[PDB]
Write a protein that binds this ligand. Structure first.
Ligand code: A1ASK
Ligand code: A1ASK
Ligand code: CL
Ligand code: ZN
Length: 318
């Protein structure tokens, strides 16, 4: 064969901006591009095919044009992000995403129940992501194709497919990448020996609390240790957010219809467990991936409860 036989392909980091390439079919993609992927699959050690003509390949950002695009799209500089995203995508593109009670869920696979619950929660709270990658993928998940959204969640949370996940920790990562700058929380803490003390929390900190599942109990007061050695009380002074997340180590808890938005239930230990999702609508639905049951009341090992909010100020006279 005289001269090199070639094909035209496009490389990308964000799957929107394309970069024309002529590739030599006698060499692998890795020899010509560095690590290369085709819709999640690692083709780095593969030589081009005629069927590859015109297709888009993900590559790592090795030149300043790809770097600017990658960061603008993903808001990250982690050198392994894009590989980790493609590894996850190769699995999540195979998962199933059924509509359960009007929401996009995920049929159980690969220990993914924490992702199912996280995805179902997102569709019930008001949240705008900042990274365009997350906006595009979330919009597409809402409509049914969550494969890219779930791979991105995995990649942002630095969990690989199959690894144990926490819903609260995942929610925390996603909240970091969301506009919550309009959120504010004022707390006060009362100690018999030490006195009063107010604290103001902003952004993410201000919509997550660890220690009680009850927003009522949070408004009324909760007991905590003080530097002196005694128990002090912490109560909510003011709240400004479209939702609040209350979390605590899993514990038997009664979910009362119409008193909360949705919740996470965790059964197991630190080694091994399973998440179910409970949403309060016309009744209480339990969504367990593809599975759906209902009940008028619920008692279970609850670990996260989501409530909604706009503005709240305490009637407690300090
Ligand atoms: C995608 C992107 C955009 C802008 C800057 C950087 N960061 C770089 S290229 N910094 C040093 C190399 N380390 C990553 C190992 C990465
Ligand atoms: C250290 C700590 C403190 C408070 C809450 C949790 N979260 C838990 S125990 N969640 C259960 C699901 N994970 C085990 C995968 C962990
Ligand atoms: Cl968004
Ligand atoms: Zn004290």
């Amino acid at each position: 064969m005289r001269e090199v036989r070639t094909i035209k392909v496009f490389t990308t980091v964000d799957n929107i901006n394309l970069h024309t390439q002529v590739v030599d079919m006698s060499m692998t993609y890795g020899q010509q591009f560095g690590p290369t992927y085709l819709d999640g699959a690692d083709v780095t050690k593969i030589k081009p095919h005629n069927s590859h003509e015109g297709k888009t390949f993900y590559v790592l950002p090795n030149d300043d044009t790809l770097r600017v695009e990658a960061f603008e799209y993903y808001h990250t500089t982690d050198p392994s992000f894009l590989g980790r995203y493609m590894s996850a995508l190769n699995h999540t593109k195979k998962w199933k995403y059924p509509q359960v009670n009007g929401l996009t869920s995920i049929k159980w696979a690969d220990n993914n129940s924490y992702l199912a619950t996280a995805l179902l929660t997102l569709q019930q709270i008001e949240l705008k992501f900042n990274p365009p990658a997350l906006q595009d993928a979330y919009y597409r998940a809402r409509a049914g194709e969550a494969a890219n959204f779930c791979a991105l969640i995995l990649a942002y949370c630095n969990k690989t497919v199959g690894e144990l996940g926490d819903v609260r920790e995942t929610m925390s990562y996603l909240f970091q990448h969301a506009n919550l700058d309009s959120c504010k929380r004022v707390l006060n803490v009362v100690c018999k020996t030490c006195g009063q003390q107010q604290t103001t929390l902003k952004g993410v900190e201000a919509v997550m609390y660890m220690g009680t599942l009850s927003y009522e109990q949070f408004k009324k007061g909760v007991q905590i240790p003080c530097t002196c050695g005694k128990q002090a009380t912490k109560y909510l002074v003011q709240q400004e957010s479209p939702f609040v997340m209350m979390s605590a180590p899993p514990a038997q808890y009664e979910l009362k219809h119409g008193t909360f938005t949705c919740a996470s239930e965790y059964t197991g230990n630190y080694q091994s467990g399973h998440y179910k999702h409970i949403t309060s609508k016309e009744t209480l639905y339990c969504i367990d991936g593809a599975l759906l049951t209902k009940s008028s009341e619920y008692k279970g090992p609850i670990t996260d409860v989501f409530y909604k909010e706009n503005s709240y100020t305490t009637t407690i006279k300090p």
